[PDB]
Design a protein around this ligand. Sequence first.
Ligand SMILES: [Fe+2]
Ligand SMILES: [Fe+2]
Ligand SMILES: [Fe+2]
Ligand SMILES: [Fe+2]
Lengths: 291, 291, 291, 291
Amino acid sequence: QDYSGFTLTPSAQSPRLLELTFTEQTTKQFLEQVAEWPVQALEYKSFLRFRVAKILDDLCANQLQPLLLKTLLNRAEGALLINAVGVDDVKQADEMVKLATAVAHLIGRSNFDAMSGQYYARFVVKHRVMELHNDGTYVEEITDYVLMMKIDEQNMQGGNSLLLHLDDWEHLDNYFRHPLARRPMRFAAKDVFHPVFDVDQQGRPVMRYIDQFVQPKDFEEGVWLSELSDAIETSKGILSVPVPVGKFLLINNLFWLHGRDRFTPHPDLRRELMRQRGYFAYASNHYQTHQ
Amino acid sequence: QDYSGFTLTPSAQSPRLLELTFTEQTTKQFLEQVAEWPVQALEYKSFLRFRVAKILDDLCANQLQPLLLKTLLNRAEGALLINAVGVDDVKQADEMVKLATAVAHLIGRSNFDAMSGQYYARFVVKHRVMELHNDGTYVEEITDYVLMMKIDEQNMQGGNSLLLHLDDWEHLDNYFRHPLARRPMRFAAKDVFHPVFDVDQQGRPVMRYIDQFVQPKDFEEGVWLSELSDAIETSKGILSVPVPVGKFLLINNLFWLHGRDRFTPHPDLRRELMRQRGYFAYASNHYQTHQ
Amino acid sequence: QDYSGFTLTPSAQSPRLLELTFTEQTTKQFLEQVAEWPVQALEYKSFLRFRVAKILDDLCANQLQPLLLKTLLNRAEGALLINAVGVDDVKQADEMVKLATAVAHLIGRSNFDAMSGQYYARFVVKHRVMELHNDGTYVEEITDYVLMMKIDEQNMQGGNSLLLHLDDWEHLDNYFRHPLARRPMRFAAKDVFHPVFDVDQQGRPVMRYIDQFVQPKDFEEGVWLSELSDAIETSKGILSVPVPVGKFLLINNLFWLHGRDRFTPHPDLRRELMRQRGYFAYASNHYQTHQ
Amino acid sequence: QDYSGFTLTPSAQSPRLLELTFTEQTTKQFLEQVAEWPVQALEYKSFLRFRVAKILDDLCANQLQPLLLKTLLNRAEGALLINAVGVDDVKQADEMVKLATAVAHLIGRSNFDAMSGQYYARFVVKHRVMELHNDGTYVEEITDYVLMMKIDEQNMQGGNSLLLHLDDWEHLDNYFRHPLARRPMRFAAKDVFHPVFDVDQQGRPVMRYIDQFVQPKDFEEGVWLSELSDAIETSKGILSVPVPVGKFLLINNLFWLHGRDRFTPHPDLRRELMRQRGYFAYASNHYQTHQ
Ligand SMILES: [Fe+2]
Ligand SMILES: [Fe+2]
Ligand SMILES: [Fe+2]
Ligand SMILES: [Fe+2]
């Protein structure tokens, strides 16, 4: 469908993943209107992250924020691949960070990243599969969304993003109905305790799982987790999504798992990534008390 | 007016800011009587900060302490620019620290400074505006006063201190009456939570704001804070105050905001500053219990 | 006796210490079936420690896990010396870690080791007695088992493992019946407080003692502990057990103490050790509440 | 008077300070009987500190421990200068540490020293007065005794130990009767709060004061503390005690203050000191509950 300032079309891999592309005029107007705040200003004054968010939504006639929220909160969808025409070179890295910052802070706020000391983190890669998982399993607070942007890609074969929607996972019911699905388990980076499965407000399964940080306490927990891991990694429902330079995935971390495919080692290989993670925060008509 | 040991006259920028100058005999007597305690002694034994305070007040016939307190606690004023005749060269830095220490510890106590590990901190600058703000917004305890002294100034164009009294701010009522003025917000350097506005004992607005450390939790808080920031930075009520070498501002941090103007970059530029921050502490006739 | 996949025979030093040796086919099948997970995978994903445990037990027709548990929990025994035919060279260090990991995680889970940052630790030695003690005396949680493997041994004379079963200690009753046996004492690596003696579920003495970390608070506690130390170190019941390359002791840390004999200094000496420590965790028919 | 294994005589400076000297046979027997434990063994196994204490007391026919306790707990005395004939050279430093350790752990236990990471600390000096004070004012637990030993002394003029017994302080009543004597004040190295004065079990004044770590909160506390400091430092009751190599003071830290006199700077100057601090711990006939 055609919106004001951007277009929206389903991905080739799945109708659950929608591709959102900002038009060229929108992209140029946005970058002009945020030129006076470099990324270092966004790092130092967090309210500027919401200022650039409002500027982008205003340029889309205030159609962007409700669309982002409706897509990410919809159980049938919950995932976007987002880009802006004209921003597609490593040479535009700062502008990429601004764009992703503006989109993310229309639907919530990105959390402190311990690897960078900032609200976002950039990594340079210079080859085995990274297993499907959820982010933020080792703290008490829930991470609602994961944002992963491709900043550079050079002599790279493979390395697609892997995604798994729980309602595409053919083994969901077998593991969700197991008593250990509800057993609170230790997660360690202070340790936290929570089950591997939970439910959304409608009672549908959600997941908070990663094989590296879950700490089975005994032979019962450990064997079940090793079978769970195999059942996830071999699922027929996994998507393999290329993320070209300038595009970023933005997914609901509660019923999407994500990972990374193998890639070929190459002497002239360079991949650069940017990530942000946060919680949803939005207005809705709902009950309160007092005045 | 003419006091014992010093003179007092309103500043050129505002009747709220009073200039206090210690006479030459007072300055020389004070420095003689505190010569046996170097600044390093003041750093190691905090009671010596109150000893030098008493010596200065005694030399002013005990007229200094009540005058400082009356000025700083008066809502109509609350700010002083202070100097002593004959102390005006970088070469006298230690004597400047002694003088500011004595004045500050007549009205309270200066807190530990994490940048220096001492009760005061000195910084050397070797050019964009520093936005108006209050100090101490990221801890639970209230910072009542801010002290900023000019220790050296060399090939410096611009860089005046900026000040804003809340009762000179033409947008005060518009933002103080907004519901978000009372919303406790996160501040981070353990995080603390407090609103951007509060009230003094008479119900008049006070502020605890800085754009770098406030952490809006969502799009509502963030957009409002970005508008608040603009309304402060563009206020017609801002003062631009030069602070020559040997002078220091001492302001009530609850209804004065402070910042720093732009200055010209220059290869031979050198500016040195000293700061202290603390809480008020003073005698008054008021109620207590027991015996 | 002859089991499926391994043999079991009493040690030459004591009927309480049983020697368990995995046959050559079992050893080769196990190493083949765990080849796809290097030790670094076991370090990163703790459930793989239980996966390799199940593979080893399955190869022993599920006779290994009940035998290990019965031996370690039996007050009359409680100690094993374990090896696998064909694994006996420093050159096979990784395979040794896999084997010990699989055995340990059939009976419990190995705890984080602060010296290595992993669930196991390897040390290289390149000569006085190490006194008998229990592990884990300076934390609140109980360490149920100690695992010590010989990874390398080169020009080494002496250095046998020393072991003492409390029911072989001729002075047990004299010290267990002393009032200070029940006095909670300070242990320091946050400090913890617990007595030097306790009881098992049947009221038989157990010990949580080490001379380096216990901190007697006064002359009464200190003199008694110095006599206790002498009564332990001179006991006639101490075993001197050689541990050849590829063998590991696995002992119940509650009623076995362990140490190390003196060895000869030698310029070409090299000894490498691996340790793990953990708690028991196993299924049994016992009571619970609710559903 | 003549005891078994040592002699006791009042000092030249004060009848409150008793000089205790171990005879030559006692010193030689003690060092022989503790030869198998080097100081590093005392550092690692704290019960050995009580073992060497018992050996020394046994060599004195068990007359040492009751004498030490009676002297240190007696309000009229409370201070000892202790040495052993034949130990008086830097070359005997280890033996000095053993001797002081044995004496201290007959009357209590020495606490962890943050400057050395051990139960004792050695310092090398290579010249202004160190003001009179009590140790341990910045933690909650009470330090009952201070031990300071002279390990080396080379080209040293001055630098006597200074001591002040509260009942020799001519200004005690003037300050003890001031309301601020009972005001809990902040002490900082987590901060602790306690008054500068307290009382012993008989209601007689004791002190917990040091000028460097007390943190007066305002002009009232600070001026009083500066006058208190002057009243202490100028007291006629201060003792000036030389401490030759091999001697150590052992004083009751509750009603003795201690410091150090000025000394002459000299290019070939070397002074080495050892300190321990701890709490009293001893048997007495007193009430308890239960069985
Ligand atoms: Fe991730
Ligand atoms: Fe400031
Ligand atoms: Fe051990
Ligand atoms: Fe001291």
